[PDB]
Structure formats: structure tokens, C-alpha cells
Amino acid sequence: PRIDMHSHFFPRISEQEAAKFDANHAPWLQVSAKGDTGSIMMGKNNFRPVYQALWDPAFRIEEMDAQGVDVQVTCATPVMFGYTWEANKAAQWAERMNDFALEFAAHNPQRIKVLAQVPLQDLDLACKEASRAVAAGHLGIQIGNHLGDKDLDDATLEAFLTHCANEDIPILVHPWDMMGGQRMKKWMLPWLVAMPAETQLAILSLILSGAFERIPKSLKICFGHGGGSFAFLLGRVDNAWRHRDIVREDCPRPPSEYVDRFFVDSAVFNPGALELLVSVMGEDRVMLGSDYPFPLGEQKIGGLVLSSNLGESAKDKIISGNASKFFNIN
Amino acid sequence: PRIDMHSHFFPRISEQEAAKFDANHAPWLQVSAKGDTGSIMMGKNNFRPVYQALWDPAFRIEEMDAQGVDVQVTCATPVMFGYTWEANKAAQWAERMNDFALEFAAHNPQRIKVLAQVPLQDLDLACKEASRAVAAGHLGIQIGNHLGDKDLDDATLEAFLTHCANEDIPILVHPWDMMGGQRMKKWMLPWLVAMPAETQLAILSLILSGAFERIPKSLKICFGHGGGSFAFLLGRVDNAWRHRDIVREDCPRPPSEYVDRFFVDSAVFNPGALELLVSVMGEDRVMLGSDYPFPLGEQKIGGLVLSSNLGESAKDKIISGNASKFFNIN
Ligand SMILES: [Zn+2]
Ligand SMILES: [Zn+2]
């Protein structure tokens, strides 16, 4: 069988629905002109054109059959996170969005699994929504990689991971709200430079802060897009750790030794990069993920892993065996 | 023989010398307490502790003998760039610094080669200093990777590369003045996350802008630290280019096809990363570089390349043959 554990949905939310939370900032879906083109909206302004597989589970199931994807885990589009909003408002938003998700999956719950969002700007609310959404059927949580200037080393965010660790709740960390200023205005550079940097920064924030020394081993956590550039730049991190005490101050072992504490998806779009990723992380900690249905995703889902020269025992863990164990899927 | 083409110096500049350009912003060297520890200074404030190999060519030659480095190409520490200063002031600074460099190399010009800086905030001055410094003995130019929000696609910076291309002047691009805001305050994250991102951004700015379609093939240009994360994230760039017209708008061929237009050093601190780097760039376009004498440099210069399983014909191009041809060294 074949699991795709990285994919997005966006719910059919009317403009009126969105306007009851925040007319200016709550995103909604406009399936207009000829109803296979939509645009995520915000207030009266467009935000991103999207296509119908983002919102239509019946359509999506047929693309899945075409691709050969038995089970697809899917979760919020990051524009739905709402980490800027007032806490209680965002906890209500998260709850709605996660009901939408379970409604999306209900069309075929055996083949469409969902992960939840949480109102991460309030730790108590966020832990509550995580437990409630997993009880209601979500298989885990998807969070953005940072909360403004708080990166994953910040005690609030570490405490959220530790809550999920203590409840067997898995987490997918997705880059979002990208660093950069005004420098990456063309050619989708934020997605090519800032996004992998964001994800590396999140992994290094956990490692170099010594967060894995405090977070129980039971945490199941996965970083999108192969972990960004993390695996390629790891030798540079180890070298810095061996030669500067300020890099060692909170991290008592070589940084590269902490790759037995997390997972990455396989979406690196290159056979040599995949071979290096599996060399660094081990065949047990890479899961097939496509970023479906977005353009910078993998158009032939699983094609990179299947066409590699990894042993077939490795190919089976990545396309299937690892995400069965990680999310608890049959 | 063995060339190390990435290394830094800093001149014995007094505080009084620095204060005649700018007391607050011009950096100077304080070889104090016990004269093998110095600190780069700025005004009355410290900036970075450095050790004597940064400023002492006689000392440096003995470390070179110890390491087995026949020829070392060295260039400014990026804090000496002065890209913020008023143009004419900075052109005078650059000229002084480049005289210092030739004075540094004069102690053994056959084994110490120098690259120059330029006052990149004025294109006419910058082209003039490049030609004058190469005529006086520099083997090329080292520039920072961006000038504020102008990245290498900006016409000013492309015109500077094109000037050097048309005069057979080689260039080393070094990351500096790192993106990030207030998010990377600990554990030297700017050097681990922002620096490789900066260098990838510089390479992608040339490729995706179509600058290599305008810059003559004669340009010899090298990017520090293996090109940052560029080589690992290249498949992700190609995928984006195949699937979004805005990524193609200025770049008429697949981005990965432009790796025959530039060079990288070999400083990636990991055998798998080096193998992938040589797979992407080819054995002809990677040059041994150490970042000597800094802590995040390679402590056993050339040890990574020599201990690899590259063919010995590949090991010879990288440690020696490529930088002989790139800088014109015997
Ligand atoms: Zn995604
Ligand atoms: Zn350097």
C-alpha cells in the first residue's frame, strides 16, 4: 500500500462565514467563474488561486486512484493557521477548521486521514484543541515552524510538543510566514530559499537548545520538505559545535546524533538529495510526502522514491511502513 | 601541490588609522594583553576576538607548512567591506585595504595570493578599484553576496560581474550581513542557517533572473561554503521552474543547467555533502577552501577532500588543479 502524509486541504468556507471571525483576515474560498478554479480570499482581496482538488474530496479520491495513493494524510493550508489572531477567536477558528477537516475525511475516512491545527498563541488553548481533535478522529497536529520571533526552542513551543509527546499525538512541522524582508520578491524565492531555511532553523532550534534532552523520547515529530536544508548542512553544524563553546552551551552531544528523535518527509525532488537524506536520517525516518495539490509539489506522487536505487525494503518503509507506524494507520 | 583558495586576513590597522575614515564604523585591530590574542574593534567597542594567524603572515606561513598548504589565497574579512559608507570614503578604504593585502602577501608572494575588495555601493568606483587592484598583483575580487536589498540580479551588481568578466578578473562571492531579524540570537544560528541561505539566494538570483544569459561565459565566479544549500535544494528549484510560469519568466532553461557557469569551494564539512556537491557541480568546479583561520573553518585543511572516495584524478583537481586554472597560479 501507499501513504502520502503531506498534503493540504482548504474548506468550502463562505465569505459570510469568514466575516464572522474577521472580515479582513479570515480566509475564505471563492469557487467561481467555472467551478474548477478557486481563489483563497481575504476580505475582498484575492490571495492565491487554487484548484479543485484542494477542496473537493470526491475529485481528490479520483486523482488519488490515478496516482495510486491508497491513504493520504492531509491538513490545513498554512494561511488558515491564524497565529496572529486574538487567542479565544483563534481557538474557535481552529475548532471549526478541524471539524471541516473531519468533514472532508468523512467522505472516505479509510483513505483520507486528517491532522489538526491549534491556536498556538495560547498554550492552554492549544493543548486542549490538540487533545480534542485527536479524540474526534484526527491522527495528529500540524503547526507552523515558528510563532513570530519565538522559534521551537521557546519554552511555550517546547511545552506544546511535550504535551503531544505525553499523549501519543504526532506532529507535522511546516514552514510558514517566511523570513526575508523585502529581498525575495521574484521567482518564488521565498519558497526556494526561505522555506527550507525556516525548516532547518526549526530543527536546529530544538537540537541546539537541548530541547530533545527535555522532550520525552515518545515525541513523534516530522518536518516538511525533507527537513529543508538541514541534512545537507549538518556537517557544518557539527563542525561549529566542536569549535565554539557558545554552540555547545545547551547541547551536550554532537548535533547530528539527534536525528533519532524526529522524522522528515521525502519531498526533495532529486535522487541524490533523497539518497543523502536517507543516509542522514535512516530508512526508518523518511516518509513519502508530496505537498499535493500544490504546484511546487510532486506531480507523480512517490515517483522519486520508487525510481531510486534504495533497497526495496527501504522503498517500502518510506512509501508505507514508516507512516503506518508514525500515524497508526492500517 | 595544494591551494587553499578561501581564507581571510585582517590588517594591523591602528585605532588612529581607522578613526581617520570613521571612528564609529571603521574596524581596527587590537593585538593586546599577550599579543597572540587580538580583537577586531569598532570605535571603542570590541566586535570579535581573533587569533594571530589572521594578521601575522610569518606565523601563518608556519601553520601553512604544518597543514601542508603550498599556496593560500586570502582576502578581506567581511567586516572590512564598508558597503554602508559614503562612496568616495569607501573607495579610499578599499584602496588602503588592498594595499595592506599586497603588503601581507609580499612576505611570501609565491605562497600567499590576495583578492581585493571594492566599494560596491558605486559601480564606477568599484570597477576602477577592481582593475587597479588586479594590475597591482591581486588575483581577483571578493565581494559580499548582497548590497542591502539589492541581490546579485540587480543591474548594478550584474554590471560589476560583467566588467570583471570582460577583464579576466575572477570573483569570490561571500555571504555577509545576514538576513534574519531578531530570530537567530543563539548558538551562532546566523552562521548555520542564514549564511548558507544567503549564498543560495545569490546563486538563484543570478540563475532565475537570467543573468547568465547576459553575463559573458568568460566570468569566473565562485561561491563560498559549497554554495550554501544551493546544490541540495536544486531539484526543488527545477521542480518549481517546471510548474510555475512566474519562476520561468526570466530563466529560459532549467536552473540546474547553469552549474557550468560558476564554481564553489569544497567547505561543506561532510563526505556525503561533498559527494553530492561534486555530483552536481562536476569535479572541475569545486576548489579546496577552508575558511582559515576562523573556528567554523576546516581545522585539518583539505582533510575532507583527501579522505573521500573520489577518484584520485578528482581529488587532484579540487585540491590544486581547479584553483590553478581559476586564479592563474603556478
Ligand atoms: Zn505543504
Ligand atoms: Zn569566509
Residue numbers in the entry:
A (entry chain A), B (entry chain A): 4 to 333
Paper text:
Malonate shares similar structural features with ACMS, possessing two carboxylate groups but with one less carbon atom in between. The additional electron density exhibited in the active site accommodates the malonate molecule well, establishing interactions with surrounding residues, including Arg51, Trp194, His228, and Arg239∗. Binding of malonate induced minimal structural alternations. Specifically, as depicted in Figure 3B, the side chain of Trp194 rotated approximately 90° to form an H-bond with the carboxylic group of malonate. Additionally, the sulfur atom of Met198 shifted by 3.9 Å upon malonate binding. To facilitate salt-bridge formation with the ligand, the two conformations of the Arg239∗ side chain in the ligand-free structure merged into a single conformation, and the previously missing electron density corresponding to the guanidinium group of Arg51 became visible. The malonate-bound structure demonstrates that the active site’s two catalytically essential Arg residues act as gatekeepers, preventing the substrate from ligating to the metal ion.
This zinc-dependent metalloprotein is situated within the tryptophan-kynurenine pathway, where it competes with a spontaneous chemical reaction that converts ACMS directly to QUIN.
